[PDB]
Symmetry: D2
Subunit: 329 residues, 4 copies
């Protein structure tokens, strides 16, 4: 049986990690601010791939410690960790054989960060989940989003429209066949048992492309629960937006629910964003979600040195002290 | 006097700064107070006529002495120290000798010290009183007029704007007519006073310090007097931030450090620099480990409220403390 | 006023009311981003919320100094809340004693003092009025709209007045809304601009009656597009929607004063947004939320003056 | 020496703090620096082997000496003072005598002092140098080991963790082998130096202070020396905030925009444009130069808010001076 179903129902609390090249710019570019989402900075300022990709040469997070990050999650009662394997910028945070645009090949750090977090989660008894941008890829000429630019974004366009301005010649199929599916096979084959699969903004993928991803994860990771944002109705648990939380909606036939939130207002690390939700806010939101059978996936944006920001760490630990006190009395 | 043994093990107190300064909330005519919003009258040399008119707007509809004492109690605080009269010279109790007080001069028309005394008595918390015995900006002969060679959290130590003739200022007149009469009032009314919180005497003679000590002793035999009354007239030493382990003799081994949660004692809109729960708990643990009481200040807002972030950080520091003490 | 509005470029908006005294906080808990919605957010009974009037004594309120700040910043008009959703009038209303003149120790007509200050300085004067929502009125609007979330709880007062089936907005419209609109349009001289808000309950006919009333009493008053379908002179554009046009914004994230909101837009942000709007022929109406003492917050004033210094420097070079 | 007349009327300078400390950005293993993020090595007693490894991660891809000098110039600043070597003992120039420097030890592999010297020359700005002549946490005989009866923005004045034997310490060795050789390097290799910024001498003998003074005089005849080289060896007095003899009537007050000299992610306490302009006007009215510090971030950038507040202070100043 898949007892990840029963496990997910009672899991209550997860850590999400956003970490990438965007973390080095830290919500700032040439004296101007990112939107609230610092991880969208490449689109926000239309930073050419040649320049943005050169951030890889400065990626050397000397204080990255997968063990200490997992130990914080565990101390907070988090039962799983979801990490960005590849965000919208298309930079892989694992050793990708199909694309050299990755943290292993292109940075002096020269380490597989997904691998180190997979190993740390295994040793601590935490379940391990993977975030992958299956639609948007700003590094790929045929990256998705080029049909969706009638709606505003946390950057400029959904796609890379500056390096790749000819929208009528764009064919996502090529990106899907050559990068998206090959990379999904890599992350689902090389990093042990994957509990959760976190797909984002499905704007371009056909039904068939969503189905192919679903079928691939099922084959490689039989017990992996797929998030409702894969597109076109292919999933195991529903990712609820802030507006969808109890006081259209997606059916959840397994009754599995998760809301992702961040501690400040950005997913990626941002120097200027000190708007940290208080311990009381974190604990009360958690209790509310859990009471309605919804998992709280709570995001950390690691800094350029690979660190949990001091205030993210203090607020997580203080929320846990409030929770433990509330559960004793 | 088993207030001695009680004080030794008390570990944690609430301080309250509340006055007319609370209404300006760290801002005057588009400009900022210093870090100390309660010093705003001196900072901008606000004439007594104008500053005193703040009394007409003092109507804190949400002031609840019971809820304030319940917060202190939930946090493991064993006593409460409150400003009866700060440097501005505005009494926060019904003073018979001076009509410049919260009872006579405000539409609130209530004795706030009396309500806190009653609330502390019913909840079993010890009750302490802060009184500015030297500085009084409302009094023509208020102290500080000899000390203006050293900078302040305002301009001058004294009211030098309403009362500019520093030669033939005579503190004795303020001491005899306001300071000692008012100290007798707070120490006679309001029941048993556990702690007496005087401010660093800049103008007081030895004899004037002695007279205050002797008065508190007579009226409140078991009241512990803070070391800032004047040289050698005290029961416990008030240690400043700079005086804390990693100095005034304390023959009873009694020590207390006062601190605030943000950087101001009085309420300040613009000061959101709230010490984190971890900072509050760790500083408390450090002080207590050295046998020092942590007196932790709240600056009540214009409606008589504990600021939301002061209350959240106090309760979170308590949750961290309880968790640390179980494991 | 048509030609004048086209070239006006910059206005000051004022949110000021009983909500300003709670300042984004109630019994240890935060308002939403909108501190002026606090009564709905915590369902504060009218008896308690109304008692805030007894504590409304803003000793530092100075309409002359507020207009002088707007003028120094190159603002050519001022729009002020005469009555927000809570239903508390900030002028001497003859039809309702729930107003700043009758119910507060301040005992002054704040709209009157701003009207006089604007006239003497040569600034145009505009009026905000909540024609639909009124939390003080048993038949206040919004009781049909609670399928969509708000910056409080419900659109209406559903706590003092929980019987939604017995509610008839017509009664509120006839007895308070239209009488009060006649008062503000009759008693405070020439009104340049009329700022109505979310029409959720108003019939077409009720919107028409308001339009016709403002037209009669204030022939030259330009009406904002949020009165109701097709009854207006200029379009109020939201941030997402960016020949008369105006966009309203605030300096922090709240319209009413909120002491916990220190998220002040920088001078550079204020100037650049203004330049962008003006380049598209859109007026920037920029909101101040006055504090409990009637003051422009220190940081609102510093950022307004610094934005003006950046603007003047950019326009010289 | 018409640097004297020039300094009298200069009114406004940019200071730069930039080093390995900038990478930690006021945070170490989940704890905060003091208000001074540049003191982080002493604050947490970070061993030299670990702290020095920050050099391997120093790759500021957005460092642009021309854009930094252009900002200073737009703000009416007439000079730039930069940290050549702070207390940690890491040189921000290509030092021949010590390989513990930004050129030899970092992948950036560039002389940052040289690029700022060249940028200042081309823009017509005067160029000044900060050097920690007493404290050196990288040197076994670094100063401060006599001064630990007074508290610091870290722990000890000296490196007392890598070098705990205080009785075997002899500053003379550090002075002879690193301090004076390095002062000769910065005063020889980067063209005309207008200003020399030494820090309060705690360990230096009178003779060692004299030798520094005499060396700067020989190599840079027109260089004005700050009063924090020992008793009576200076050309202008560095006034503290609380102090607001000078036989040339030359005065300068240094301040920072937030509360830290080095970059600190957690310190968003930026003085407002109005505060910067009013403090400047006050200092200038008393004949005091305002030296205003920027702490560059790990990518070599002026923090967004430091740049916005500098430009807005200038707009307020220009407006005030027209009306
Ligand atoms: C968790 C969030 O999902 C969104 O759709 C993304 O666009 C954001 O970057 C973020 O990762
Ligand atoms: C507790 C504090 O003691 C200081 O010395 C006073 O000057 C402050 O205003 C405050 O009362
Ligand atoms: C200007 C804004 O318009 C909205 O409709 C209101 O609900 C807000 O409180 C504010 O007054
Ligand atoms: C300019 C400042 O004053 C001194 O030099 C140092 O102690 C500080 O870190 C900083 O360099």
């Amino acid at each position: 049986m898949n007892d990840n179903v029963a496990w997910f129902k009672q899991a209550k609390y997860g850590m999400m990690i956003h970490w990438g090249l965007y973390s080095l710019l830290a919500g700032e570019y040439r004296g101007e601010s990112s939107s609230a989402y610092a991880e969208w900075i490449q689109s926000k300022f239309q930073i050419p791939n040649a320049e943005y990709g050169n951030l890889a040469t400065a990626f050397n997070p000397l204080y990255f410690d997968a063990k200490k990050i997992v130990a914080l999650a565990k101390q907070c009662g988090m039962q799983y960790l979801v990490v960005t394997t590849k965000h919208h910028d298309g930079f892989a945070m694992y050793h990708s054989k199909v694309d050299a645009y990755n943290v292993y090949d292109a940075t002096p750090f020269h380490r597989d960060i997904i691998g180190e977090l997979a190993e740390a989660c295994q040793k601590a008894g935490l379940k391990f989940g993977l975030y992958y941008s299956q639609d948007l890829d700003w590094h790929d000429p045929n990256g998705g989003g080029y049909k969706s630019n009638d709606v505003e974004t946390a950057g400029t366009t959904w796609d890379n429209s500056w390096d790749f301005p000819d929208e009528d010649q764009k064919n996502f199929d090529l990106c899907f066949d050559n990068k998206i599916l090959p990379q999904i096979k890599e992350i689902m084959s090389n990093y042990g048992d994957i509990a959760t699969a976190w797909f984002d903004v499905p704007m371009t993928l056909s039904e068939a492309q969503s189905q192919t991803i679903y079928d691939t994860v099922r084959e490689l990771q039989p017990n992996c629960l797929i998030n409702s944002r894969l597109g076109n109705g292919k999933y195991d648990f529903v990712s609820l937006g802030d507006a969808e939380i109890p006081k259209g909606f997606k059916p959840s036939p397994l009754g599995l629910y998760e809301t992702a939130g961040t501690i400040n207002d950005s997913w990626g690390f941002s120097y200027h964003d000190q708007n940290w939700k208080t311990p009381r806010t974190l604990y009360r939101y958690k209790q509310h979600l859990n009471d309605f059978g919804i998992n709280y996936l709570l995001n950390v944006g690691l800094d350029p040195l690979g660190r949990v920001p001091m205030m993210a760490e203090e607020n997580l630990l203080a929320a846990k002290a409030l929770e433990d006190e509330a559960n004793r009395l």
